[PDB]
Amino acid sequence: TVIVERWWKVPLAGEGRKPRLHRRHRVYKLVEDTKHRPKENLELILTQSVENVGVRGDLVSVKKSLGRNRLLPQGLAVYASPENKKLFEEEKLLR
Amino acid sequence: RLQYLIDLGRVDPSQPIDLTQLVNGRGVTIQPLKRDYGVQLVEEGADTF
Amino acid sequence: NFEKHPKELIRGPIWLRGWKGNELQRCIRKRKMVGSRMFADDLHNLNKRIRYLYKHFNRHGKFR
Amino acid sequence: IPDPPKHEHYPTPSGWQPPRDPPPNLPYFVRRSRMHNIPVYKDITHGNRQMTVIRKVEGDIWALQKDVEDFLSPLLGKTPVTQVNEVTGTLRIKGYFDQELKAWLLEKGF
Amino acid sequence: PLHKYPVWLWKRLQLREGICSRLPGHYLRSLEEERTPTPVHYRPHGAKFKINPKNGQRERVEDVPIPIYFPPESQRGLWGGEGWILGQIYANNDKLSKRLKKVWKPQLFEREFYSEILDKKFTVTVTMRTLDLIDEAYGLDFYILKASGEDLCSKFGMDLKRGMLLRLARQDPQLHPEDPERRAAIYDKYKEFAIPEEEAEWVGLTLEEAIEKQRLLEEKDPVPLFKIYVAELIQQLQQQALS
Amino acid sequence: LTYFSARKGKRKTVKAVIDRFLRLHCGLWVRRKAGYKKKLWKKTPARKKRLREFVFCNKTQSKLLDKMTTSFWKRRNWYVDDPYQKYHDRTNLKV
RNA sequence: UUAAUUUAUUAAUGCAAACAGUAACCUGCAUUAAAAAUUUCGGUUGGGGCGACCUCGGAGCAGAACCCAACCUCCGAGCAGUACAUGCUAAGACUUCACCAGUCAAAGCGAACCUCAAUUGAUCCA
RNA sequence: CCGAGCCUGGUGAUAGCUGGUUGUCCAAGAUAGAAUCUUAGUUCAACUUUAAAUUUGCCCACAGAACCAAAUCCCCUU
RNA sequence: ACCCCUAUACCUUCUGCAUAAUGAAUUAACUAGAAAUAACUUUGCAAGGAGAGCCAAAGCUAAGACCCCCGAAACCAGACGA
RNA sequence: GCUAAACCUAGCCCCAAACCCACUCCACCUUACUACCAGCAACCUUAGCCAAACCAUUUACAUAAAGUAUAGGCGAUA
Ligand SMILES: [Mg+2]
Ligand SMILES: [Mg+2]
Ligand SMILES: [Mg+2]
Ligand SMILES: [Mg+2]
Ligand SMILES: [Mg+2]
Ligand SMILES: [Mg+2]
Ligand SMILES: [Mg+2]
Numbered sequence A: 001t002v003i004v005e006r007w008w009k010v011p012l013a014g015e016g017r018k019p020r021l022h023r024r025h026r027v028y029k030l031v032e033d034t035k036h037r038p039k040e041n042l043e044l045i046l047t048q049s050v051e052n053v054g055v056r057g058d059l060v061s062v063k064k065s066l067g068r069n070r071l072l073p074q075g076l077a078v079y080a081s082p083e084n085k086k087l088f089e090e091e092k093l094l095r
Numbered sequence B: 001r002l003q004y005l006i007d008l009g010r011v012d013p014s015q016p017i018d019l020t021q022l023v024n025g026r027g028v029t030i031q032p033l034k035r036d037y038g039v040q041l042v043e044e045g046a047d048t049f
Numbered sequence C: 001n002f003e004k005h006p007k008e009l010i011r012g013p014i015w016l017r018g019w020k021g022n023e024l025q026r027c028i029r030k031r032k033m034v035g036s037r038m039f040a041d042d043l044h045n046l047n048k049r050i051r052y053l054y055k056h057f058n059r060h061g062k063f064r
Numbered sequence D: 001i002p003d004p005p006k007h008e009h010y011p012t013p014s015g016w017q018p019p020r021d022p023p024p025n026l027p028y029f030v031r032r033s034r035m036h037n038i039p040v041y042k043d044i045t046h047g048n049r050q051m052t053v054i055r056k057v058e059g060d061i062w063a064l065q066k067d068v069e070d071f072l073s074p075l076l077g078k079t080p081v082t083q084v085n086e087v088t089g090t091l092r093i094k095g096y097f098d099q100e101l102k103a104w105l106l107e108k109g110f
Numbered sequence E: 001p002l003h004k005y006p007v008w009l010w011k012r013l014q015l016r017e018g019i020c021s022r023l024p025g026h027y028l029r030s031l032e033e034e035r036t037p038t039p040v041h042y043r044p045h046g047a048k049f050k051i052n053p054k055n056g057q058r059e060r061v062e063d064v065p066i067p068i069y070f071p072p073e074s075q076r077g078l079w080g081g082e083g084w085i086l087g088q089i090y091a092n093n094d095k096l097s098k099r100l101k102k103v104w105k106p107q108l109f110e111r112e113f114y115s116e117i118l119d120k121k122f123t124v125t126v127t128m129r130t131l132d133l134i135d136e137a138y139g140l141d142f143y144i145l146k147a148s149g150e151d152l153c154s155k156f157g158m159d160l161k162r163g164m165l166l167r168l169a170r171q172d173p174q175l176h177p178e179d180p181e182r183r184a185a186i187y188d189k190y191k192e193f194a195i196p197e198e199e200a201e202w203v204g205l206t207l208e209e210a211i212e213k214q215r216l217l218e219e220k221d222p223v224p225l226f227k228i229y230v231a232e233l234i235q236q237l238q239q240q241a242l243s
Numbered sequence F: 001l002t003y004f005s006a007r008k009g010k011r012k013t014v015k016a017v018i019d020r021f022l023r024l025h026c027g028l029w030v031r032r033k034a035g036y037k038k039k040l041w042k043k044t045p046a047r048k049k050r051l052r053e054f055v056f057c058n059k060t061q062s063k064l065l066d067k068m069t070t071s072f073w074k075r076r077n078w079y080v081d082d083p084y085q086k087y088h089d090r091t092n093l094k095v
Numbered sequence G: 001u002u003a004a005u006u007u008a009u010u011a012a013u014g015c016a017a018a019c020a021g022u023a024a025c026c027u028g029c030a031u032u033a034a035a036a037a038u039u040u041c042g043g044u045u046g047g048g049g050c051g052a053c054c055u056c057g058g059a060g061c062a063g064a065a066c067c068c069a070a071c072c073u074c075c076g077a078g079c080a081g082u083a084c085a086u087g088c089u090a091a092g093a094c095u096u097c098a099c100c101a102g103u104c105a106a107a108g109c110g111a112a113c114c115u116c117a118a119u120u121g122a123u124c125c126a
Numbered sequence H: 001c002c003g004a005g006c007c008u009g010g011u012g013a014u015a016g017c018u019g020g021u022u023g024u025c026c027a028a029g030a031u032a033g034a035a036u037c038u039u040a041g042u043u044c045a046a047c048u049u050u051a052a053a054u055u056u057g058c059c060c061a062c063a064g065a066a067c068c069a070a071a072u073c074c075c076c077u078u
Numbered sequence I: 001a002c003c004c005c006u007a008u009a010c011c012u013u014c015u016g017c018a019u020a021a022u023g024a025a026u027u028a029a030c031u032a033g034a035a036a037u038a039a040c041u042u043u044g045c046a047a048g049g050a051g052a053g054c055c056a057a058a059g060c061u062a063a064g065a066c067c068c069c070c071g072a073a074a075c076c077a078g079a080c081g082a
Numbered sequence J: 001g002c003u004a005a006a007c008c009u010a011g012c013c014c015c016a017a018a019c020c021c022a023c024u025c026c027a028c029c030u031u032a033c034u035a036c037c038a039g040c041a042a043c044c045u046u047a048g049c050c051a052a053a054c055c056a057u058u059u060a061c062a063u064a065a066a067g068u069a070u071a072g073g074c075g076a077u078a
């Protein structure tokens, strides 16, 4: 997403009102894009041991493309939610 | 001004002189819009008070 | 004992009911107090008048 | 507005004094204001013109005017140049003479 | 002359008046609400007051959203809560140069997507922000459920949500025989959400669609008057018998 | 100078005037001199001194200023310790 | 158009963003093009054009308080030198016929024991 | 009636330019200059009008206003 | 009645117009000064005034009293025309 | 004495209140007013005049606070 700051300062309006605008409040100023940014590594739990990237049961931070394109659709990995985490822990304990 | 008020009956010196009393007397008009932060006490009638 | 004002006695258009005004001012008042429930064509006319009136007052004239 | 409390000694500190009883029998009478002051006001018309008004006159304003004139001739070396107005019992007097006028009124006993 | 009710209420009035009155109360409420969406193309002000520079004085600060534009492609498939930004730029970001008009488009992608509730792989026009949102919410299904109708910003998405809700309600054979336990587990995964079936039918509908549905519901061929007459006669006879 | 504004129908104020001048309650407008912070190396001490003084305005000029502002700016102020407070009221005049 | 301001449109590039592996299409930001777009075309002047001039100062016209023109006659300026109390204040005046700008200056406090005819530029912005 | 159609709207476009601007009567009333994309205009000054407050205003006589004609300024009396 | 003597239509625009400068055949009805602050005015009240808020070192509230008409070539938006 | 004059009520303006209309039969999206036969489909910042005495950023579309904070070739103005 493109985040766009507003040049020209909307003049503020009420509690239960909408501020009416002007053809100059349409004049924006680009602040940032969410791409062109340091990418984050998402945390995924693993249902299989794959390559050197991970082991069965271990939660791991991975590149996002890998997570999305390969691991999650094939059923090799699961999202790091508080729901399944407990289950994983239990499994580990059992092991 | 205060002395005058006292003389005239309005603004009673037997009771306290809070701002409210002054307002009632109508020696001091004040307006929060136009940012008046109450009354300042001034010397003008220092002697003969 | 000031239960009512004589400006509540006056019965006329809802916008100028205890309120004098100018021409332009009157128009402005009408546009704000009624505008939303005015007939399109009439609204447009009013707007035009306002545009005109402002120009006449704020620019054209004598004694500026 | 409260009618003021009866003090021990007059005039009161701040120079106020009530109207004496009985009234001073004359051709004219001067009421006081809402606030119990003697109604002798200053007024500037044009940035120039300065005058004073005694405005609560009642009965024979002409007499009052005459009296005023008599009073003020030693202070000027003229007559003061006054305008009475019978309808609204007033007296426009050219030039500031307010405090003095007030004093005079007090002396008279209005 | 003037109108009775202002022009910005006419739509509201319409609802009251006719077939839209006979719509169920739980649907119309949604239409009426109009809550603000989550900020996407603007960084919101955290607090309602701030203290500006220049003068050391606190004053209020309302965060106004950027208008946004959703082309009909967006409606067809999940984008985030985002679309086109029609605006204007000053030439070199200085006001004393030309002002000139600009459309910022978002980066669209095509992706497959599984859903446990529906059991199907959908190919969608998705953007990266959408993906991120999904990740945050964990499941796509979860995201669909969790994400509100005014932040979903897509008709297709709404439809999907509705379908999911219906599935939750009915407890339909989605995975068929051999997977009843599995089905149960899936259902239990989404114990949250799952509205009564008569509400879930109307979720994610437009107004026109809703109206159409209503019409369909209360359609019916007219009852022959003859039958009614016969019934009346019977009643009369019964009465006579009684007396 | 906007004799009737579009939303209210009031006189607006020429804000430049407000920025530049001080309105004393007597009627007099105070201004800072022009070129008082420019090319002081070539200016001689006396000249500099002259430049640094707070000059009063004319009659016509004053009138113009008055016209350009509204009755808010003409009002009586009672600021805590205003350096100019003493100059608002005017004493000892005679035509 | 080789006038100023723009490139929103097309133009390829370049970098991102998406992607894949192994020891291209879209979108965002930059780039120079092509196309265009928004544009304005100062004054004085014995008509206008061309030429000349446009701010400041001294002399004549203007012979004796000020003031006084022309595309009238003649000289010049757009600094330089010396200081580093070329400190700070401040009664009272002059004034380029308005305003703005300019000039002079007693006393005082603080210290010693300016030359020059013009030698210059408002506001806002930096 | 094409150097860029016609129609409606924005548009009572805008015009330092031209034309026009309607009962009676009386009164005071004439053009030093300044800047200015300014010299077909305008703001200030000057003149002018009104209402005020005023105390001097015009006319002026001796004395006086530099060195390299006609007059003027100043100016008590009247 | 005329003959005698006296008498250079009107408006506009001009330094200046009988001008051979503009306009006007004539009648009809229609056809062009509208707004604040600040002043002045006369009322009301008065160290206060105002029927909240505003103003106030005689002020404040009140009314009264000033500020035209017709005209381009234009630019742009959406229709309609081979 | 001809042309002519003259004439009140048609209706209309501004409000107030009150939320309007729309199938006798037949015909009417094809060349509308046409009885009767095998293909598509709506959403996409207004601009400019104008003011700034040019023009290029910019230029308005109950009461009170307040024409205040702000904004602005820090100006027009908002
Ligand atoms: Mg409010
Ligand atoms: Mg008065
Ligand atoms: Mg020329
Ligand atoms: Mg020539
Ligand atoms: Mg001078
Ligand atoms: Mg000294
Ligand atoms: Mg016009």
Ligand SMILES: [Mg+2]
Pocket (backbone or CB within 6 Å): H016, H040, H041
């Ligand atoms: Mg001109």
Ligand SMILES: [Mg+2]
Pocket (backbone or CB within 6 Å): none
């Ligand atoms: Mg005369």
Ligand SMILES: [Mg+2]
Pocket (backbone or CB within 6 Å): H037
């Ligand atoms: Mg210039």
Ligand SMILES: [Mg+2]
Pocket (backbone or CB within 6 Å): none
């Ligand atoms: Mg001529």
Ligand SMILES: [Mg+2]
Pocket (backbone or CB within 6 Å): none
């Ligand atoms: Mg002649």
Ligand SMILES: [Mg+2]
Pocket (backbone or CB within 6 Å): none
């Ligand atoms: Mg002839």
Ligand SMILES: [Mg+2]
Pocket (backbone or CB within 6 Å): none
């Ligand atoms: Mg002629």
Ligand SMILES: [Mg+2]
Pocket (backbone or CB within 6 Å): I022
């Ligand atoms: Mg002519």
Ligand SMILES: [Mg+2]
Pocket (backbone or CB within 6 Å): I022
């Ligand atoms: Mg001519």
Ligand SMILES: [Mg+2]
Pocket (backbone or CB within 6 Å): none
């Ligand atoms: Mg003719």
Ligand SMILES: [Mg+2]
Pocket (backbone or CB within 6 Å): none
């Ligand atoms: Mg008329």
Ligand SMILES: [Mg+2]
Pocket (backbone or CB within 6 Å): none
């Ligand atoms: Mg133009």
Ligand SMILES: [Mg+2]
Pocket (backbone or CB within 6 Å): I082
């Ligand atoms: Mg053909």
Ligand SMILES: [Mg+2]
Pocket (backbone or CB within 6 Å): J051
């Ligand atoms: Mg313009």
Ligand SMILES: [Mg+2]
Pocket (backbone or CB within 6 Å): J053
């Ligand atoms: Mg103009």
Ligand SMILES: [Mg+2]
Pocket (backbone or CB within 6 Å): none
């Ligand atoms: Mg031009």
